[PDB]
Amino acid sequence: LISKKRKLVADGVFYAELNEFFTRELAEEGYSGVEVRVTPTKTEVIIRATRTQDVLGENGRRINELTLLVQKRFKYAPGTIVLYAERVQDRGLSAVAQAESMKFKLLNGLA
Amino acid sequence: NVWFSHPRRYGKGSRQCRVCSSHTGLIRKYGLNICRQCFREKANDIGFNKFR
Amino acid sequence: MLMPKEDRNKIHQYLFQEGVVVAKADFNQAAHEEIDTKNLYVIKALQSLTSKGYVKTQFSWQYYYYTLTEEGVEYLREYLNLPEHIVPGTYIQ
Amino acid sequence: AAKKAAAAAKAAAVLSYYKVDAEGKVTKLAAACSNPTCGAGVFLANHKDRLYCGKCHSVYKVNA
Amino acid sequence: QQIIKIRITLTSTKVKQLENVSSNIVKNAEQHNLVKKGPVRLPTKVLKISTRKTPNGEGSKTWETYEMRIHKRYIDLEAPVQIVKRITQITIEPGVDVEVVVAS
RNA sequence: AUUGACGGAAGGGCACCACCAGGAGUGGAGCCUGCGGCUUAAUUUGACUCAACACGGGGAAACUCACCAGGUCCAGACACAAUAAGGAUUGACAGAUUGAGAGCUCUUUCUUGAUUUUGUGGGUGGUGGUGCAUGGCCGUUCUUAGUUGGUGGAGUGAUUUGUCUGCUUAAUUGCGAUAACGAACGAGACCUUAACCUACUAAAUAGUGGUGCUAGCAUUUGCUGGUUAUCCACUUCUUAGAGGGACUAUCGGUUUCAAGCCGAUGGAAUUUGAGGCAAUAACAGGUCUGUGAUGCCCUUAGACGUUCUGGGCCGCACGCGCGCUACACUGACGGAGCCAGCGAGUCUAACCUUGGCCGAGAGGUCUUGGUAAUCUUGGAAACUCCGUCGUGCUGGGGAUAGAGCAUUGUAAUUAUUGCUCUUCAACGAGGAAUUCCUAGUAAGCGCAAGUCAUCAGCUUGCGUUGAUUACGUCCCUGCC
User: Fold this and answer.
1) d(C-alpha E82, C-alpha E99), whole Å
2) Is A18 inside any structural domain?
C-alpha cells in the first residue's frame, strides 16, 4: 500500500536495476533496455538483445540463473518471475549496440 | 562488540545513496532515499523527461 | 578470516542447493536474507570461494550478485557429502 | 607512547585436573560447574574466593 | 444474481494508451448495457525535481524541472460476481494501473 | 604561407549583469549578520575581479567539531614464536585519586577463567595533508549562437569555401546572392505549470435548488437563518480526467510587394506567459572537510583513532560587502469593519492541537479530532471604517537598559524566546560610488515550507494591492 508520486516513481526506478545488473553482466549479449509488465497474473520482462545462441543455458539454467537474482533481490512469489530473451529486428540503427560494437572492436587490438 | 558500531539514526551519515553509496548530496523526495549529482544521469529514463 | 564446522557449512549449503545468492555492502548488520549467517559473513567466506573459480562474482546496483560456477558446483558435491543425481534451478524447464 | 603482543594461547599441554585413580576407576574433582551447559565435564579453575568456570566463555560464583 | 456497484481508478504517464483503455472502458461496458458514468477526469498530479546541473559550487548559479505528469484519471459500473470479473479481467496493457475498490 | 588564437587596429551586430527613458534602492545611520584584520589556551576550516563575501543548504549553549585545556578505553584483524590450566589474562567494591558513583591509578586479595596478553609479521582506523596524483558531479566562456561533415566542386597540401554581400529574427532564425548539392547535432520542435471550455465524466472527504425539521424579523405571499442525510434531485460552479482549442487569424497597409513588420476586429488567450532539458571545445576555476568514490605520502595506542566534561568558532579602536525598521498627519496609536494563495501533520509515539475552562499576558491545561479536499483550517497583514493626536526630535524614532514572570532545554552564565511595566539612544531623506528592472512588470504588506528541541533581521515559494518609464539604440562597457 503506497500513494500513487510514491508508486510510479519506485516503478520507474525498477528500470534503473534491470537497466544496470543487465549493463554489466550482459556486456557481450548485445546490450540492446527491455517492458517492465502489470498483467493480472505476472511481472514479465522481455529481453529484446542480439544473441539469444548464449543467453538461452546450454537448455532454458542461464535464463533459471537471471531470475532465481531478479526474484531473491526484489522479493518475488516464485512464478510472478517469466524471462521470455526474445533477436534484435532492425539491428543497423541500434545506436547503443554499434557504439557496444566499438568499446569489443577496440581490446580485441585494432587501429 | 560499544567497541564496533553509533547513536546512526538521524542526520546525514545514517542514510546513504542507492546507485555509489555516498553521503554528499541527497534526494529524499519520494521513496528517492540517490545523490543530488547523479540523479538526471540515467532518470531522463528511470519518468524524468522534461517539459522547459 | 576465522569463522565456524553449524555457519561455514550452512552457506556453502542456498549458495549448491539454490545453486545463486545475492547478499548488500552492509558490514555492520543478527542478519542476511535467507541465511542467518549477521551478513558480513558470506561476502568476505565468498571472497574466498570466488579467488580458484568454484564461483563467479559480478558487482554494481551495491549487493555483490555471485551466481554458480559451470562443475565448480562439484567441489560443493563432495564438501556437504551429496549425490552425483542432481544439478541445482539447473534442470528447470 | 609504546603495542601489546596478544595473550599466550598458552601451553597446560596435558591436563588431569579432574580423587587419575590407581587401577580401574575414573573420577571427577573440583566440582563440575553446577549448570546444564557446563555438562558433566567442565573442570572448574581456582581464583579469588569464588570459583571459576568456559563452555560459557568462563563466568561462575560457587566458593572454594 | 447478487448486484455490486464497482468503481474503476486509473493512472499513467501517456494521455496515449490511457484514453484508449475509457474508450475500449465505457464501450466494453455499454456492449453490456453498464446501470455507470463517464470517464471522470482527476485534477492534473505533477513533480518538478529543482536540481543544479553541474557536478561541482563550480560555475554560474545553472538550474534544471523534470517531471511526471499523470492523467490522474475514474469510472463506475453494477453487475454480479459473474460479469464484472468476465471486464476488471479484460482492460487487457502497457503503462497503466487498475484498482477495483468494490462496493458490496 | 596556415586558423585553430592575440592586439589597448578598422568595419558590423546582440544584451537595462550596457546606456537612455525613468522607479525603488545600496553606500550615511540606529541595528542584523558574513568576510578582513588585531586578539588569543584556541579565536578551527574551504573559499577572494564578473566565477569569495546570511555562501559549504554554516540558524554552530552540549553534540555537531575540524581549535584546544585535559581524562580513558581499543572497538591492534590475520599468521608465527613466546608467557603456559602451577593461571593468558579479565573484572571490581569502597576508600586513597578527580570533573566524577573512571578500579584513571594505588591500598586489599577476593574474582577471573585459554576467548585474552606480549614481541615478530601486518592491517585497518582517519573532516590529517596533496583539487596541480584523480572520480564523479556542479560553476564559467553561456537570458550563447554556434559547431561538423560527406558526396560532390573548387583550391602541393597545413587544406575551403559549404559557414556567404545583403535584408531577416529571441536566434547559422529564415528567403534570397551562390562550384557549391543535400544532411547531423545545438536552437526550435518537445516536457512542465498558469489561463478557456454553461459540451461530455462522477462525486455525505466539492456545492445547488427544492425539501421538511426549523430559529428570528415581516406579517404580503415575504425576508433573515440553523440542519455530514429529512430526503431526494442536480453538477454552473469547486475539483479533475479525458479531451479539444491559437495559427500572429481576418482585410488593411508596409516591403526585393521575398523573409518579415506595424495597426484594428474577433478573441479567453511580447516564444500563448514562464521555466526545465542545453551541443562543439574546454578551465590545470572549485571540491579527497558528502562519501565505505579515490591515489601516493603520513598516521597506528603518551595515535592526527575516538569519548566524557567544561570553554572555543558569538571575543574588538577598527577596513570591506548581503540586510532589517525609520526621518511622519499620504503617519502613529486605538476601537470597528474585517480579507487569499503555496504547505504541513501524529506510528509505533507525541505531529497538529481546536473546543471548554485557568492566566493582564506570556501561557497552562484538560480533554478533543485528525495518517488528512475528512481535524487544527473558512477569519494573515497592507485597508475601509470612526476618531484621538496637530507641526511640539513629538503622539515620528524603539536604541540601550533595570527587574521580575513565563516557555522550552542534563546544561540556559558570554539573559534561546516570549512577555509583563519603565530607562526614551541615533537620525530630521543618506557624499565618492554604484546597482538592478519593460507587465500583475518595480516595489511593500504579510505568511507556509527549508533548518529545527528550540533561536530568522536569511533561503525558497506564493498570492492580496499594484503604478511610473521605454517598448529604442551602439555614446559606453562586455562579449560576439
Assistant:
1) 18
2) yes
